[PDB]
Amino acid sequence: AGKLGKFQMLGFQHWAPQKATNLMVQLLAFYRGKSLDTFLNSFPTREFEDDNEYYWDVIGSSRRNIPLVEARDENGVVVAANAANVGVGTSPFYLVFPEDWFADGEVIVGNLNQVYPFRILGDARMEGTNAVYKVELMGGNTQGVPAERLQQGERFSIEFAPVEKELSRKVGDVRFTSPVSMRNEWTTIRIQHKVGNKLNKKLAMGIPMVRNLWMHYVDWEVELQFDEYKNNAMAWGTSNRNLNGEYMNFGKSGNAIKTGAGIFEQTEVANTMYYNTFSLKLLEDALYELSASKLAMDDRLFVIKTGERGAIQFHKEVLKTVSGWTTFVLDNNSTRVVEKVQSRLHSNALSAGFQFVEYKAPNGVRVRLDVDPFYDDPVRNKILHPMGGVAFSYRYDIWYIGTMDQPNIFKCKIKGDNEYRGYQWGSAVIHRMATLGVCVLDPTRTMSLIPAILQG
Amino acid sequence: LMGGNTQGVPAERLQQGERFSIEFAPVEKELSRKVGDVRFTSPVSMRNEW
């Protein structure tokens, strides 16, 4: 559980014979930079007319039950938690709700459904925005409703509106709802370089630790390191607005620098967990309660995207869980952790090794595992984990919870060509500019398990 | 501080040895001016003889 230094990266300011090979050599004792491109191209794109802010429709749900504000007896005195029963002998009492949602002559039920049904004896007398109903019990209930079952926050649903068969009068009503909507923004990126094919002042050399211790194409570095400015703005970007709509950072021209959130900030507004130790007890409980309330049983496949060391940590946590399944005797006949390989050295020659890549939870919750290579970035990820890696490979990200009939996460784009280029010959400065954006429609369909050492 | 931060960075997060990494260079929508730069790398050589 310890490193050894195999390289050191130094700037140049802190410093022909024959060639064995013509092309240069990348040593394995050197980290190499990682693209965010395969992660970003894993998402679709959607083009827009202009750089104006955009909005879309969010459609919700309808079935409400109404919390209680307070209950009162027939003289107006409120009901307390330690009080006696209310409505003894079908004596009427009052039931204060923050809204007018029920109608005259309707049976409503509290937390204990149908044990104490309440029949509303008239319209709601207004008290500010509150609505006070006179109610009474509707089940042959002689002894009243207890005072615990008439406190604040108790939910009340509608049941029906029963009448008498002879000479009845009108009761009941119907109820209506409406949808909501949400927004997103864009952001603008710019690069420059004062240049032709030769390096300039930001140079760094890589010295390896071994025992006895060309010409730069500038048009390939301004395209690669500006493609990476757009990759970092897309995936790792942050918004600078107030809740007053005010941007907080102003540029060189006095106009505000407008920035929009990225992939990893928009999906970290829901379902996000920061753990200090990894468990399947935390993972299978987080994924079941989300699937029990949102997903059908067949539609419960969860593809964990994580790093390479997140795969060996998930392997040892399933293996610890399997090692506590003392009911079942795991054999080599089915699992084949020791199989028979062909070798010159022996007739019966064996092999050994295995890895848990999937975990199947009760009620159809299936957890799979694949590795994205961009979690293991030595440049961006700088806090290290004591088990090896860069502590961001231990981050688990469930993208694509369910089926949506449309993409949830995509890359916004302006139709035509929103990338600009310019050369300022004096001084010879190459200028590039690009506007971009990322949209996550439903961030509640993305679960993240981040280590808590990357927080705060 | 850029990310909407209205409480400041902690003093623990500004000590010697903490590594820093370039993300991107943002500008306005209006009247923008030049920002950012490009970084390069240089090779060293190994040797053998006959």
Partner: peptide, 17 residues
């Protein structure tokens, strides 16, 4: 050319001369 493990190549940015 980006490697299969997302690693970029630094030898494309040079010119042999």
């Amino acid at each position: 050319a980006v490697d299969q493990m997302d690693n970029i190549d630094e030898r494309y940015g040079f010119v042999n001369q």
